[PDB]
Design a protein around this ligand. Structure first.
Ligand SMILES: Cc1cc(CCCCCCCOc2ccc(C3=NCCO3)cc2)on1
Ligand SMILES: Cc1cc(CCCCCCCOc2ccc(C3=NCCO3)cc2)on1
Lengths: 296, 245, 97, 48, 245, 296, 49, 245
């Protein structure tokens, strides 16, 4: 009735093999007593890096050890623990005189790869899923607090991006806006994991267009639309000149984090957003350098 | 019973008498897409044996001065074989891989290659040297297919990241005094159940000489390195006409 | 198993013994072709030097899988990886590896 | 067909060329039917 | 509930509102090869949806003087689609078909096409007219692929056999006053479990006007006939490189 | 654990659907009584040939019928019944003077498509499996019986085909030969279904080579090696001239027959073996012709 | 070198299907192979010679 | 526990550290003659240890051009040892053998000898070259005893039979990269329970270089091949005076 190779055909197994399990690691591993071992056949110290596995040699088999009850915690090295710390990710200028952002409004493309500290941290992993708490610290360039009313509006990709301080999009009938005086404590808001993918992707090795991929378009290599969350717009709430030069610092703090596929830490300086370019001529070593391997 | 091994998939069988065990990427065997993980509502194609097999794609020559090479993956196998076809006709693709890099020499030769799997391996430019120019790596460099590409600044994996740390990735070494081949088994890894085999490359295969090849003169100097990969649990959906890119 | 004369080229009568084995030596490139042969048993060619080949000549038809073991006789110090490939019917003699 | 997956490697002191001997037979599922006479051979002179 | 019908395979769906039931060749649905019927010891590929679907290959124009056309089958579907591919890469092929020929006209038009399936449809030459010359039909005639070929002597099916008897073969008529399409479902039929899709054609599809097309002038005169076929239970084994012929 | 579409996936059903069953047909169908039927809704006489099925209208519903117990047999219309009748399939000349077959030996390619009566019968079906009984009637061209000794040898494809009357192949050490005097009743032998296919194939729409298929090779279209059973060789048993002109008629009778896929009966004259060519200019109608459809 | 024929099964060399081999081996027996009449001797009894 | 081995019979012990298992001729250990298989009515002598032991009879030098050698057996062991004696004094003889051919070289040398046991190894002449002369191989060639004889046309084993097929006989190879000795254990094989050790030779030992000896210059070039055989289950009957031949 069947053909056997069809009854066996393990084609369609949705479950992943595994091989490894997750164990409780509340504290560091304890050290149990060790004694001299003079025997042939058992060689812990001998390993083979070629295999591709880290040496599994225990302190106990390398020296006579005492007993130590390690109660040191590992809580501070969790992801939420490590990543859930507010950091600067965006900065916006609203000067009186200038060419940057006059007219009293600004459209900041929501991209957290513009500030080296925060960027390097996350670029530790390839994928990352999480909610976040955005805080907005506004004031004048002197750090002086001023009685001015702003309006921050999150504009999802597709929504009409404001063209002027008095644009119609500021009616914000469905977009979520926040009205704040620069004298009120920094506005703070909770943001869900909004993406069509299951995790944000710091690195996307490929294109999104699907076309020819000529020279003029290599601009898109590495551009993954599942991270383009839209823009953040801000404007002094009025009809006339703001009267004061403003600056908004955007701080993001992740929470409910899930990270996957750890990769090498950024070695060189950063040059552009969403683009791992590096200075070809100024390729500095990862660390410090000595004069000889035989001296400190 | 650990240095010798045989890998058999489809109608292909690889033999090795000096291998150093098998690495299973992130400790997970390649699986098919779950019913609750998928979204594409059309019933996919699972060619099985016609595409899940060992394609021996390329050979490089290791020289006392070689810098290293890489191959972007989803792609490398396109245009070649029935796999290639299903990857061009279908929009959506999904699959794990069994990568077997081989390279032998004599007991009188010496050297050591690092063989890693770097997921989402985005390439970067030298930025015009000074760093003022916002250049971008060309299609010929980001998606070299077979033949791979040679690294220009291996120390930073042409992407500003230390190769010294590349081992946090499924890797294996080919130390000539110890073995003559590496074997990594990577599962499908992406933030999506399926994606276009064409314009997205799930990971790159790195093969870099960390300890330079060397041998007294007179010993055969042609030391090749051959890549042989095999898709596993290949699934395709979203059938249309055939597409090259 | 009996010796398959893959190298059925020499005929000098003083070189008949070298039909029994084919050579393999240090190449200078990538994926060179070592040897090639018809996988047909009851046909003229290498298979005629075998015991199987000969018994076939006595029967009009046959069926079953065939096995061909290749023993390497080089020195212990010589290393190497060969790729033996059987290409089914309709497949023209491959131009490359 | 037999191709070079990599290359024949050797140290200084070993022959730069060696040989492979092929041996062949049939698998367990092999069978033959309808016997005839061989063609491969037929004598010329009549047996003295 | 007998004149309307819908055929759905793979990602293709054919609709018809004037069909006249479905014929099942020799009363047998296409099946896969049994374990005791097969000989090829390698596990075959059963692409399923990627090849078992509706390929709408050709359109002919029916004219008040058309002689008739035929399409050899295994072949017709090569080079086109993933089916084509599996047929070129693999030596052995096996599969049944769902053939749907369609052709509509108005209630003011009239005519009747015979649509048959002739297994092992060997073509013959006129033998140089007199019959003294031992000519042979050319590759372009015996294996026309899509586009089919036009009959030169339909009365004898260009093979010395009366078309008057062609109905002992799975057939169906397209009488314009009655229907607008034929639907035959042929199972795999050969004296072997598998055979080369390339050099052997299991059967031919015949479409001949027995009762000439006719209509008073002024009514749209372009009356097409379109062939749409779909493989079923496709199986392939004996994988090698890709072959055209 | 599975993916559903895999648990269902009826891919791999080795059994054929059927739809129709074989019933016992020892005698012709009987006729049961019929009476007048004047009713709307039931119309037996009305059919639709388009469907592609033969009319299923019974005599009973077309006219008032009596009852008839049909005990006529159907045994004579079986395959063994129909095909198991000896017929001429091969003829061989062994003349004294001539150019046909002197030297005293002949190699007849075993092909039964050389004689129109027998050929047409079998070409009724596409495939055919069966055993056969070959009979060999030998004598001189005058039908005169002569005291001569022949040797018939079946030479399978691959075995050495005799090159002369005194060839070495006549040692027939494994080939099956038959020695007969022309004065002995015709030699007769039982032959099994020897073929690598499951049934002989009268029509093979395709090639066997697998190559280019140019003009010069169209010779092979329709040539199926699964029917090339080898040759039949005959020779007068000696060293010198036979002394009498001979002729061997080969009669084949099938038995244990299985036939499949019936096709149209040969309509035109035959011109060549294993090749359905027909006279292009002399395409005669299937049957007789009248002067008008309104007269006999 | 051992001197034994390779015992490698088709199954371990490639992914295989299931095949029920019912082909007979009767024709390859000795009686089967050798029990076929053949010429072994020839004798002349000429008039003149 | 398969490459090292020790053979101990009588008062002789052979050691080997690179052997490749042991072949047992036709899968049958040497046995004594059954009561229903025998005919000689006299109670035989079974010297046991005095004749069932390891006689190391000869050494040949393998050269880059050696053709090959053979030794006829029953005979080879006559005149040498107590075995020899019992073989000359008795008419009837019976016995199996444990043949151990050894030949070592370095890991830098290469070559491969075929070591076979050919039962009833009848030698033939070249027939005077043309084939018109009915010559016959001389006593010195058909029964060379120890020292064996060198083949003149190994391709045909000086007997018109392909050496390519010589492996249907209890054989073993001496591939220098793999082993350094062969070990065959042949049982008594004749169509009689006993026969004269003198004028009948149950089988020959063949040692032929199929893959020529070779090594870069400077490596010891004297590569010997030594034969060591040991009778097993030796039985003798029909005692008379001593006979040479
Ligand atoms: C009220 C209110 C709240 C806001 C801002 C909401 C911001 C939500 C941001 C979520 C950002 O997730 C990111 C993921 C990836 C990247 C990225 N940049 C380079 C490629 O990856 C940037 C942001 O505006 N107004
Ligand atoms: C004794 C002895 C017996 C014989 C003759 C044995 C003949 C066995 C013949 C079986 C023939 O089966 C056929 C099938 C197909 C065709 C064919 N011809 C055109 C293509 O099909 C011819 C013969 O010779 N010597």
């Amino acid at each position: 009735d069947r053909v056997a190779d069809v009854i066996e055909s393990s084609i369609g197994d949705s479950v992943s093999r595994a091989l490894t399990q997750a164990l409780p690691a509340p504290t560091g591993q304890n050290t149990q007593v060790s004694s001299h071992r003079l025997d042939t056949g058992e060689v812990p110290a001998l390993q083979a890096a070629e295999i591709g596995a880290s040496s599994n040699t225990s302190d106990e088999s390398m020296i006579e050890t005492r007993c130590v009850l390690n109660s040191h915690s590992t809580a501070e090295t969790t992801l939420d623990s490590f990543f859930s710390r507010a950091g600067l990710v965006g900065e916006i200028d609203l000067p009186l005189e200038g060419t940057t952002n006059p007219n009293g409004y600004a459209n900041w493309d929501i991209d957290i790869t513009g500030y080296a500290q925060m960027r390097r941290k996350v670029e530790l992993f390839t994928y990352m899923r999480f909610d976040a708490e955005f805080t907005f610290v506004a004031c004048t360039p002197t750090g002086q607090v001023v009685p001015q009313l702003l309006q921050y509006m999150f504009v999802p990709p597709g929504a009409p991006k404001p063209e002027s301080r008095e644009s119609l999009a500021w009616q914000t009938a469905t977009n979520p806006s926040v009205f704040v005086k620069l004298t009120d404590p920094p506005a703070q808001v909770s943001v869900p994991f909004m993406s069509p993918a299951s995790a944000y992707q710091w690195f996307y090795d490929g294109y999104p267009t699907f076309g020819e991929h000529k020279q003029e378009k290599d601009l898109e290599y590495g551009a993954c639309p599942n991270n383009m969350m839209g823009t953040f717009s801000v404007r002094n709430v009025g009809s006339s000149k703001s009267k004061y030069p403003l600056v908004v610092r955007i701080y993001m703090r992740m929470k409910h984090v899930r990270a996957w596929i750890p990769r090498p830490m950024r070695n060189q300086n950063y040059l552009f957003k969403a683009n791992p370019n590096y200075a070809g001529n100024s390729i500095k070593p990862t660390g410090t350098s000595r004069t000889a391997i035989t001296t400190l | 019973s650990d240095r010798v091994a045989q890998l058999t998939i489809g109608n292909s069988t690889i033999t090795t008498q000096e291998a150093a065990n098998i690495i299973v990427g992130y400790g997970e065997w390649p699986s098919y897409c779950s019913d609750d993980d998928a979204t594409a509502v059309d019933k996919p194609t699972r060619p099985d044996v016609s595409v899940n097999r060992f394609y021996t794609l390329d050979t490089k020559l290791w020289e006392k001065s070689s810098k290293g090479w890489y191959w972007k993956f989803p792609d490398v196998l396109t245009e070649t074989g029935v796999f290639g076809q299903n990857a061009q006709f279908h929009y959506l693709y999904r699959s794990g891989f069994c990568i077997h890099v081989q390279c032998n020499a004599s007991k009188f030769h010496q050297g050591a290659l690092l063989v890693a799997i770097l997921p989402e391996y985005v390439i970067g430019t030298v930025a015009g040297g000074t760093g003022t120019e916002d250049s971008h790596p060309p299609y010929k460099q980001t998606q070299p297919g077979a033949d791979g590409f040679e690294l220009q600044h291996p120390y930073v994996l042409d992407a500003g990241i230390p190769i010294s740390q590349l081992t946090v990735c499924p890797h294996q070494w080919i130390n000539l005094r110890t073995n003559n081949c590496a074997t990594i088994i990577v599962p499908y890894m992406n933030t999506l159940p399926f994606d276009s085999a064409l314009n997205h490359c799930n990971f790159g295969l790195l093969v870099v000489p960390i300890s330079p090849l060397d041998f007294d003169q007179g010993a055969t100097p042609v030391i090749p390195i051959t890549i042989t990969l095999a898709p596993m649990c290949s699934e395709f959906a979203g059938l249309r006409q055939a597409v090259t890119q | 198993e009996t010796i398959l004369e893959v190298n059925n080229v020499p005929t000098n009568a003083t070189s008949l013994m070298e039909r029994l084995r084919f050579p393999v030596s240090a190449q200078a490139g990538k994926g060179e072709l070592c040897a090639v042969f018809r996988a047909d048993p009851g046909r003229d060619g290498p298979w005629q030097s075998t015991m199987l080949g000969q018994l076939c000549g006595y029967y009009t038809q046959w069926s079953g899988s065939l096995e061909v073991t290749f023993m390497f006789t080089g020195s212990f110090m010589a290393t190497g990886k060969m790729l033996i490939a059987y290409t089914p019917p309709g497949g023209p003699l491959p131009k490359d590896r | 067909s037999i191709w070079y997956q990599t290359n024949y490697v050797v140290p200084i002191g070993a022959p730069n060329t060696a040989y492979i001997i092929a041996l062949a037979a049939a698998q367990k599922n092999f069978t033959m039917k309808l016997c005839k006479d061989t063609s491969h051979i037929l004598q010329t002179a009549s047996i003295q």
